[PDB]
Amino acid sequence: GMLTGCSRRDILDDYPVSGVDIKLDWDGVTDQLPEGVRVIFYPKNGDGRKVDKYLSVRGGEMKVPPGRYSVVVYNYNTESIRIRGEESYETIEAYTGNCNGLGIEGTEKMVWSPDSLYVLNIDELKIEKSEEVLRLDWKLESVVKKYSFAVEAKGLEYVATVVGSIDGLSDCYCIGKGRGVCSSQPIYFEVKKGDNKVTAFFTAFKQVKEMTMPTRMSTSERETSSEKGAIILILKFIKTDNTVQEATIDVTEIIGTLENKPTPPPEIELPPDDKIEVDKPETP
């Protein structure tokens, strides 16, 4: 392992600071609270004077000097999810690693499913010069969508293991931009095999931030581009002789059906023409 050290702002103690007090509400956000959150203030006026702090899951005091900023708040302790581009609001991106150490061919080209990420991103916040502590009341947004499905498949007796992948979903999330992005690298997921069914669970980032920013004012005509992307589910059946048979399913029109005492996963009905059948392995 290799660690990256940092220090506090040296003229944060020399220059006057009207501190802020962040309170975080998690009511109806999640019952499984994160370890804590990271808060970054990117100055708009200033030459890269970013005020950065790790806080309690409930928030806390933080000394921000006055000025116009862009803000990001996300949960730091995550398994699959990694952060890059933290130097600028416009580049801070959440991503997953490529599947390493799996025994099935082609998993190296795939990325892991993202674990839970909670984000708040304000394009513009103006901290004024104040004698008293400015009180922010924030709530974070779950930017990771969960999916599940079940599909009927003949001859699973011939299958050793099944490896699922889903192309076309957001496997990256631009925290500052508030949009998910697709790296064209499939998200890998394990598939549970029954006798006549296969069940799987996976996750992906939201295409776009759903939080309402009542104060956000855009001068550019509103953006809509979801349809310019096909969503393909791939089931890689590894046979008992280590042979592989793949099944490619286009879930573009039903992807929403798959989002979610728990509920059994939605069945992906196939025409009798496109039924999944694993052919008995060849014999000498």
- Which CATH number is 203's domain given? 2.60.40
Find residue 134's DSSP bridge partners: 20
Rg value, the chain, Cα: 23
Torsion of CA 222, 226, 227, 230, to 10 degrees: 160
Torsion of CA 105, 107, 110, 111, to 10 degrees: -170
Is residue 232 in some structural domain? yes
CA distance 189 to 167: 12
The one-letter amino acid at 129: K
Count structural domains, the chain.
1
Task: Give the number of other Cβ atoms within 10 Å of residue 186's Cβ.
Answer: 23
In contact, 97 and 112? CB cutoff 8 Å:
yes
Token look-up 């130097």 returns: 87
Is residue 181 in some structural domain? yes
Find residue 59's DSSP bridge partners: 23, 56
Query: What backbone phi and psi angles, to 5 degrees, belong to 195?
Result: -100, -35
Is residue 33 in some structural domain? no
Is residue 203 in some structural domain? yes
Domain that holds residue 195: 145-211+227-284
Is residue 112 in some structural domain? no
Is residue 8 in some structural domain? no
Residues in the chain followed by a break, C to N above 2.5 angstroms: 260
Tally of residues, the chain: 284
Which experimental method was this entry solved with?
Answer: X-ray
Angle at 145 between CA 256 and CA 40, to 5 degrees: 140
Is residue 268 in some structural domain? yes
* Cα–Cα distance list, 154 to 82, 232, 266 (Å): 38, 21, 18
In contact, 226 and 255? CB cutoff 8 Å:
no
In contact, 236 and 164? CB cutoff 8 Å:
yes
Instruction: Look at residue 239 and give its three-state secondary structure.
Output: strand
Question: CA nearest 117: which of 87, 73, 149?
Answer: 73
Q: Quick one: which H or E segment has residue 258?
A: helix 255-258
Report the side by side order of strands in the sheet with 244-250: 244-250, 232-239, 159-167, 187-193, 197-205, 144-154, 276-277
Is residue 26 in some structural domain? no
CA distance 99 to 185: 11
Question: CA nearest 140: which of 226, 224, 25?
Answer: 25
For the chain, the maximum distance between any two Cα atoms, rounded to a whole number of angstroms, is: 85
Strands 276-277 and 144-154: parallel
Q: Give 261's DSSP letter.
A: -
